[PDB]
């Protein structure tokens, strides 16, 4: 007799621009990400540290897809770098762990963004 099915533990739904940004990240297109990061700096459209509902971040998705140039551009534009080294280690790839180990000290100015 029509058992009601509904999302009882509802996460905050992603914004359309955020969905476009992470879809571009998982797509692997290098050119599309850069305009998004510049417009997120200037126009503050996209929060870079947003979180899709299945436990992933743009840096972290770039870790799973093992692309290093998207890694370098994202971490140049100040993604939250913490806890990402463990996913790279579990990925068992030398390039990603070397890249996050090397760029822990990019002459950090004004501490970290809040």
């Amino acid at each position: 007799d029509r058992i009601p099915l509904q999302i009882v533990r509802a996460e905050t739904e992603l914004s359309a621009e955020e969905k476009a940004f992470l879809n571009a990240v998982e797509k692997g297109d290098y050119a599309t990400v850069k305009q998004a990061l510049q417009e997120a700096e200037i126009y503050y459209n996209v929060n870079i540290n947003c979180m899709d509902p299945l436990g992933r971040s743009a840096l972290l998705i770039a870790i799973e897809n093992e692309n290093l140039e998207i890694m370098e551009l994202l971490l140049n534009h100040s993604v939250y770098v913490g806890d990402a080294l463990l996913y790279a280690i579990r990925k068992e790839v030398v390039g990603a762990v070397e890249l996050l180990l090397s760029y822990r000290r990019p002459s950090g100015e004004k501490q970290v963004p809040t």
Partner: protein, 305 residues
């Protein structure tokens, strides 16, 4: 404690609101402090007449009288008071002034230029209104502390331009209230940093960012639709359709102002969750800003109960 951010695009009126928090809530600028703005009044005046003259080339506008050509040369090298007067009163110069939306001209240009006799006297001391009218770019943060209704206001003035955006992210922590300033008189203007960009569309997209940002879910969002005085004058000669091609209302202050308010308030993507507290303002009008800021403070108190 109330953390208050003054945000908005370049030239929207942020620092002018900051000047008002001095005089409205405090003794305010001293004669000596006024005297410190004299060189700024002069620079704003000189740079404004230079800007109009320079534009006359781009705009294909001749001097009303040939004799002004040498005054223009003299102006660039620099008696100065006489030269500026003759240029300002020239018919070619005035024709260019009338078309200032086609270049970049300070809002206070005619204010000063029409008062040239007064401001050019050797004994000139800027008045408090002269100070309010000055244009000084605001680069970096301008945190100042003020106390209203016994609230300890921690106020952050920041650069409105797109070059100044980098500073904004550091100040986003613990914001009780944002006063977001919009120059009403910018529907037909283009950005100084991008002359293919209309100023009002730039102000919308930022307000789209600032209103819907997850940092400001609990922050009280106050919208100052500012430069109401300039807008009242401009609307009688420059149609709103320049900015909003779909507008079918009148080019009158009340209707056009109301439409702009609607366009900004529509950018709120959480209308059944969040208010925008909108006021029409003249930031250079002390009485007006005092009344509006009193009302704003009441909203903040009521929202922090």
């Amino acid at each position: 404690e109330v953390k208050l951010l003054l945000l908005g695009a370049g030239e929207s009126g942020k620092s002018t609101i900051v000047k008002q928090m001095k005089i409205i809530h405090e003794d305010g600028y001293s004669e000596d402090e006024c005297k410190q703005y004299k060189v700024v009044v002069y620079s704003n005046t000189i740079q404004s007449i230079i800007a109009i003259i320079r534009a006359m080339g781009r705009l294909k506008i001749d001097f009303g009288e040939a004799a002004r050509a040498d005054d223009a040369r003299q102006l660039f090298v620099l008696e100065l008071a006489g030269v500026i007067k003759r240029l300002w009163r020239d018919g070619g110069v005035q024709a260019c002034f009338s078309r200032s939306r086609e270049y970049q001209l300070n809002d206070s240009a005619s204010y000063y230029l029409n008062d040239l006799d007064r401001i050019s006297q050797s004994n000139y001391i800027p008045t408090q209104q002269d100070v309010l009218r000055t244009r000084v770019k605001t680069t970096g943060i301008v945190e100042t502390h003020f106390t209203f209704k016994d609230l300890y206001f921690k106020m952050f003035d920041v650069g409105g331009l797109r070059s100044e955006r980098k500073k904004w992210i550091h100040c986003f922590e613990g914001v009780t209230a944002i006063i977001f300033c919009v120059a009403l008189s910018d529907y037909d203007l283009v950005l100084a940093e991008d002359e293919e960009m209309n100023r009002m569309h730039e102000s919308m997209k930022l307000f789209d960012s600032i209103c819907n940002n997850k940092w400001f879910t609990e922050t009280s969002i106050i919208l100052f639709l500012n430069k109401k005085d300039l807008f009242e004058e401009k609307i009688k000669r420059s149609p709103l359709t320049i900015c909003y091609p779909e507008y079918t209302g009148s080019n009158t202050y009340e209707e056009a102002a109301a439409y702009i308010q609607c366009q900004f308030e529509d950018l709120n993507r959480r209308k059944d969750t969040k208010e925008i507290y909108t006021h029409f303002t003249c930031a250079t009008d002390t009485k007006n800003v005092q009344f509006v800021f009193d009302a704003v403070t009441d909203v903040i108190i009521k929202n922090n109960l």
